[PDB]
Symmetry: C4
Subunit: 395 residues, 4 copies
Amino acid sequence: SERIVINVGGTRHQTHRSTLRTLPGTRLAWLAEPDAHSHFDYDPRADEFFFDRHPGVFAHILNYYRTGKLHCPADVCGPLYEEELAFWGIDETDVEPCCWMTYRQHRDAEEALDRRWQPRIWALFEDPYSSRYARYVAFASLFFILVSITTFCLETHERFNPIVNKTYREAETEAFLTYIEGVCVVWFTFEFLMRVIFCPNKVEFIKNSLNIIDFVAILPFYLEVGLSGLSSKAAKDVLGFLRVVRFVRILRIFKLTRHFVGLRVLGHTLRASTNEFLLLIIFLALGVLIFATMIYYAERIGAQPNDPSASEHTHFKNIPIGFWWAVVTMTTLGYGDMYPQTWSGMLVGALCALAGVLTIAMPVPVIVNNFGMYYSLAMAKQKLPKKKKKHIPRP
Amino acid sequence: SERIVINVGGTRHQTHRSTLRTLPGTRLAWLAEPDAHSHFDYDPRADEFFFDRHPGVFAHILNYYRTGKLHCPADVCGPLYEEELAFWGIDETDVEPCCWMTYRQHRDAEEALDRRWQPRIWALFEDPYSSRYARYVAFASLFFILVSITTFCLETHERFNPIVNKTYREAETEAFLTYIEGVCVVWFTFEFLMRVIFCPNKVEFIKNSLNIIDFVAILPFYLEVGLSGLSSKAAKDVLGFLRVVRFVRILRIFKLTRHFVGLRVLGHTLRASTNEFLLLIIFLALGVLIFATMIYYAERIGAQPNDPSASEHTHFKNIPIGFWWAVVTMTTLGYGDMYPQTWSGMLVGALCALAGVLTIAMPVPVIVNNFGMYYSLAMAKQKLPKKKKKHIPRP
Amino acid sequence: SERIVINVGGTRHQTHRSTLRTLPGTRLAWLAEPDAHSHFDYDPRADEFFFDRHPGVFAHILNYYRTGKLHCPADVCGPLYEEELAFWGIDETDVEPCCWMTYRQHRDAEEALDRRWQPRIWALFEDPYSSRYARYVAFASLFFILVSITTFCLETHERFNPIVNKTYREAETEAFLTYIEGVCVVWFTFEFLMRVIFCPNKVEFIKNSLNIIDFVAILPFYLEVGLSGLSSKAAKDVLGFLRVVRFVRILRIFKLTRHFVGLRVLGHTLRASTNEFLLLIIFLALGVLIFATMIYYAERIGAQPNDPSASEHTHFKNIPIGFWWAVVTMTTLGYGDMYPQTWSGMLVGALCALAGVLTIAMPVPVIVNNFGMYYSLAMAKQKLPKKKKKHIPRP
Amino acid sequence: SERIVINVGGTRHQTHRSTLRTLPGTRLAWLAEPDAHSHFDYDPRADEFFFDRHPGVFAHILNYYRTGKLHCPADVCGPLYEEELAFWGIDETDVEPCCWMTYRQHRDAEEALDRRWQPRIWALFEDPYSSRYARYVAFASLFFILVSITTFCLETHERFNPIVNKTYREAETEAFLTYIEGVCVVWFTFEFLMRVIFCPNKVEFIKNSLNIIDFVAILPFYLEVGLSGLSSKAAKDVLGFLRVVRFVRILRIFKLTRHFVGLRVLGHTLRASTNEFLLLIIFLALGVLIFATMIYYAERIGAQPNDPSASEHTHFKNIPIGFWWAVVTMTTLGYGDMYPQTWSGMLVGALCALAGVLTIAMPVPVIVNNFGMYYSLAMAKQKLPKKKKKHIPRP
Ligand SMILES: CC(C)CCC[C@@H](C)[C@H]1CC[C@H]2[C@@H]3CC=C4C[C@@H](OC(=O)CCC(=O)O)CC[C@]4(C)[C@H]3CC[C@]12C
Ligand SMILES: CC(C)CCC[C@@H](C)[C@H]1CC[C@H]2[C@@H]3CC=C4C[C@@H](OC(=O)CCC(=O)O)CC[C@]4(C)[C@H]3CC[C@]12C
Ligand SMILES: CC(C)CCC[C@@H](C)[C@H]1CC[C@H]2[C@@H]3CC=C4C[C@@H](OC(=O)CCC(=O)O)CC[C@]4(C)[C@H]3CC[C@]12C
Ligand SMILES: CC(C)CCC[C@@H](C)[C@H]1CC[C@H]2[C@@H]3CC=C4C[C@@H](OC(=O)CCC(=O)O)CC[C@]4(C)[C@H]3CC[C@]12C
Ligand SMILES: CC[C@H]1NC(=O)N(c2ccc(Oc3ccc(C)c(OC)c3)nc2)C1=O
Ligand SMILES: CC[C@H]1NC(=O)N(c2ccc(Oc3ccc(C)c(OC)c3)nc2)C1=O
Ligand SMILES: CC[C@H]1NC(=O)N(c2ccc(Oc3ccc(C)c(OC)c3)nc2)C1=O
Ligand SMILES: CC[C@H]1NC(=O)N(c2ccc(Oc3ccc(C)c(OC)c3)nc2)C1=O
Ligand SMILES: [K+]
Ligand SMILES: [K+]
Ligand SMILES: [K+]
Ligand SMILES: [K+]
Ligand SMILES: [K+]
Ligand SMILES: [Zn+2]
Ligand SMILES: [Zn+2]
Ligand SMILES: [Zn+2]
Ligand SMILES: [Zn+2]
């Protein structure tokens, strides 16, 4: 009576029926029922029930039954213990805080990480290795995107933008850069039309940020061509705004870098560390405010109440400029454009540097470990390709 | 004789009675008593005592009995082993140093982390979500605190503080900033009176730093209003001191940020890493002193004993200024306002930079791991809300 | 029927024959064959098969058989579990991603880390301790390499390179430096000839980068001596190019430092962290481009469309210069030669500093842990010299 | 025959006699002897030998016997496994490299961390809490050491060192600083004589660096007093040298800080990380040399062979100055006194910054983990005071 022997994989586990009955509604409680002999795998010769499971972790499940707190064995994986808990009927949300992080770790990382020739036309954007012409198409896209970025950067330069005499010496960009941009634009509009020919799930295609960027980058050239026909002052202002807008041409490099695994892992880490990024932002804002105020007040210790020369011997004429000084000092950047020149200001600056180091190194390690785990998991996915299951399940 | 079998959860542990008698006053010693058969769960058919506990950790407790040193199994938690030690009667303070840190880790983290409508009136400060008007009240407090901080920072500026001609061109702050501050102050005094209406445990309410800050921030406006009535030079000096005191208005943001979990975790980490902060302070002070002296003496190698031009070609006219140079160089800030200009001074500066890196990276990682553990524990508290126990203890 | 008992090192493991038959072609499946009694170690008295292996890990192998996913026990080593898997016939490539990194860790680190007197002549380069004259030879090589590097650095100086009056005041290097270089060169050519005397595997000897460097460093002196005979303008240009080429003399220090274990470990880490170095390069390039464009556009907010004074109050005259500013700001270097001077530019600079910190601290920790593991393994190789096996294997 | 059952703590371990005989000279081999029944604890009823030890680790020792490689269980401590190996006769130096670091970790940390009233006189230096007058004596030493350091730093200042008119306006230090130094010196010489009164083990007392520092700091005042009597030019030169020597007064603070546990741990870490410090030094030297040469040659790309204006537009007039630039850039200090001004020089500077970050972060983490382990161990020594053994060993 009250003595029940559970044989888990050849290991005899002995406990009381009241111990099993403690947790109701589970398989071991059903074992603690007067019909378990007729409801389970029981042999009368040994008076023991046989379960074909892992005894090393069944020890810990029975220890949960005994004590009342569910822990996870540190000598097996979270997934292994989770499968055993699922079989034995235990809720995985009963696990103690001392086990929760190491238990829900691989699962959290995995959840963070995760018309005849119309397919032939849609293969234009597809993996360059997945076809023969796709390789050349992708290489041409690489070359044209790089050339467009280079032409943009050269357009911002001064050697290619001279001041020719005109209605005064107005500075105009050399026209060969515009011709190169025109060639790039005709290629890019060919590619965009070829990809728009095949647009399954047009809602998702429009919602796609990469194609949004491509259209936004292709608009300004045509808007400029149309604008130049009309010679008005408002046309000139819109032309200048279009020149500002042309910065979207450098965003086309994310199309090229989208396939890099480290970039995808970084995106996953950014999406999963929102709380830590907010923590860093709040720490920086509080430190910047406090240290800007402190340096403003410390750089005029002993100054007269209304002497205009109070702010004449300092870089800290106000608190908003101390904001910039404080961020530069806390990041250990130290440009040197503004620094304290008084003993109290130097004390405050030393405090600011140390506090910046500490409150930068608080959440950055959390984000770093998140990235490390996600990168390792993705790399394992790359090192271990899916293969034959090799395991034939029992019917 | 002398052979005793302990059956712990179906696992037969065999040891000598003298081995059990080694540690007196404990449950296993009582088992090694001639009456254990009449004092414990003993069956004569098998000549074994049955205990319904964890055998994997009972192995380690018996190993303590055998060898004489108590260790902790690395395949279970500190709390699990602590519960087993509490049941078996072993003192948790006998654990070896090789186990103490990993054993007393979750426990240390947990100890670091932890009149009809008078409640309706006291709900004014309560959680904004805990009521309907509290949401609007908290949003108004947010807006007014931010506006007061903005008005303070603008008051320190020069665009809003012109030099109008008066008894000379005295610089006076624009009065619209003072009017905005007055509106903020009337709102804040309404809030303070409404919270003072309900003040249970007035000793604790006075001791509360947040309300102390609120009163200290609300005093200066009224003190200024009263002071302006009396036109005296001492009144002007007290007015200037009140202008200095007005910096307490930026401390009201801690009322808003008090509810952030990362801020509470940071406070816990600061309170728990006092020794490491003192270690960092001592390291920095020793390095600053040594390197200031070394750079002072190295920047005049070969100089004449009393030539006044000895200090003319150097930024290091003395040692106290080398203190500032040394802290800036050791934090890898590098403002550049003062640097060595001699070969020996550059050697000393390289030494200073490397030593600063090392003696900054010594205790900062300890503080960082403390923060990481506390943050993870608090986050687990947030991921796993308290629910039904699900465990019905035996009577 | 269907009940089979496996005795692994005195521990009875019980499972179903269908469970063993799940994974075909392995030793346990052969055990689940009607002839296992005649094909294995079986005794009819106990109806159990005996295997003389580790039961604690056999539990996990049988758990793989039971559930269908292969994991690794966290309480043993990867090599231990690998040997057990090799014995039991399980493929090591079936291990789950949650186990792959901690399993294939030591193995990955190990794979990263790994004519009468003609031998007497070839002993000239050999380990200095491996002979008597080799010690003096290696010390002489040390002294001469250091002297050559010192003479190079002094040659670049201005105190040793005066402007003597000649066909004008042409600046010529003092001839005593050239004489010292000549002595060093005659020693080095003696050493090179002595090592070329014994050149086993001449293909590998030529492919050896150290000897390539030695020959490239010894060529310029003789090329200069031959060139000075011919007095032509093209001869002067080739002489200047040879002066540029003389920088290869500082590369001879890698011959001296080749034997340092930390340098070999660093080479292994560089070879094994190519993916992480590419990740760092891509992150830096993307950040530099984005932040250079952003600072260029933010430093002229509100500027006129074609006012030439738009770029007059800024260090950021174009985007390529912003590349340099961005790298300096992201590395937290902060030279201060160019910084933002506008509120929007300061916002962008704060963003740049924080983003640089984060995207520098993402892959650098991965590289750091790689180096740490490899260094620890190499140091263990140094702490535990190979000794007698002490284990006599059974025939 | 050939079948032997070992009963280790109630757990039956079964193996072959040849398996035990594999490792000769050990206790299990002696068990595999025809007399083991008469040489060990054997009962004929069960045909098993009983050992009262830990079965979980005996499994791993027997696995060493079986396979031939000795590993350490990850679910127990190094000290626990070491005690078991010592009992079973296995050499601890047979452990595999995959186990050596985690096994020899606590032991390595522990080895790194470790005439009537003549005792009354010698109590003058003793722990201030260990007596009543010692508290006041130590506080007086604190005050006098701090005052001496302050007087030194003030002596280096210019406000306290005016140029009074004398044989010209020679700058002489104010005499009140010298009087304060004289008071400090008389106190310190009293303390030194009182400590020299009781000098057990005079060889060790002389070898003690703290007392060496105290004597060296007390000499210069008396040497100055004696020197001032003789008015000679050589006397003035020796006086100036004594002024230089007076820097030893700041070294007296190590007497005060010697008792801090973090300082003792830092000393242990410095003594135990000599290899890593040499690694850091070699990495820095190689990087500094390479990048100084590279920046020197990159800052004059396209310059004429002998144009004196080649070095006129650069901070890098030679390679030795590039050494300083390179160290400043690699430490991410960035003073800004010298920076590249050419596109190639900026490329080289970006390379230098990244390489400096990487080769600083390579061995610094190793040193940091060493310090962390030693600090944790020392802190455990402080958290767990030695108490009653509580364990009565068997005779
Ligand atoms: C400081 C430097 C390193 C830039 C800042 C890094 C991140 C803020 C950005 C830059 C590049 C971005 C990546 C560029 C491209 C992609 C592909 C993108 O996938 C697609 O859009 C594919 C088509 C689709 O399904 O929409 C997913 C996000 C990701 C990884 C981005 C995630 C966010 C990243 C890492
Ligand atoms: C460099 C920047 C990040 C500022 C420095 C950070 C810490 C020095 C300070 C700033 C904000 C502080 C927090 C602001 C508000 C609170 C709420 C406070 O709780 C209350 O006062 C609630 C009412 C009460 O019971 O008293 C407890 C401390 C804490 C977490 C503070 C702990 C110490 C913190 C983290
Ligand atoms: C920033 C500083 C630290 C320099 C950058 C470090 C690495 C980029 C370089 C510098 C020195 C190099 C090492 C110098 C010498 C050798 C010996 C070399 O071995 C031989 O060539 C021996 C003969 C042969 O078999 O070829 C193997 C590479 C290694 C470790 C090199 C690996 C790459 C290292 C670490
Ligand atoms: C950059 C700053 C942090 C200074 C550099 C730190 C270390 C290079 C030095 C500074 C203070 C030194 C400590 C000062 C005093 C002592 C006490 C000393 O003990 C005694 O001399 C006691 C009497 C004796 O038995 O000799 C042992 C070394 C230690 C810990 C020293 C170890 C080396 C330390 C940590
Ligand atoms: C027009 C008044 C002018 N005169 C003067 O002596 N002061 C002053 C007075 C007291 C003070 O106190 C400090 C000191 C240091 C810190 C960090 C601090 O943080 C807010 C406050 N700071 C300046 C003036 O501003
Ligand atoms: C008025 C004397 C004037 N003349 C002179 O030659 N010196 C001098 C002498 C010796 C010295 O030694 C050093 C060198 C380097 C360091 C780091 C050091 O640390 C304390 C001490 N330093 C300077 C003078 O100060
Ligand atoms: C000749 C036109 C001249 N006038 C003007 O007002 N601008 C301008 C307009 C809008 C803008 O928008 C921003 C603002 C910030 C950032 C970071 C940004 O990133 C690309 C873009 N930046 C500048 C001019 O350049
Ligand atoms: C008096 C000759 C003068 N003229 C000239 O054009 N040069 C030159 C030639 C080639 C070169 O090559 C490089 C480039 C970059 C690096 C990093 C490098 O590392 C050693 C070498 N560097 C300079 C001169 O010095
Ligand atoms: K840093
Ligand atoms: K810096
Ligand atoms: K800097
Ligand atoms: K700087
Ligand atoms: K830095
Ligand atoms: Zn737990
Ligand atoms: Zn232990
Ligand atoms: Zn697993
Ligand atoms: Zn191992």
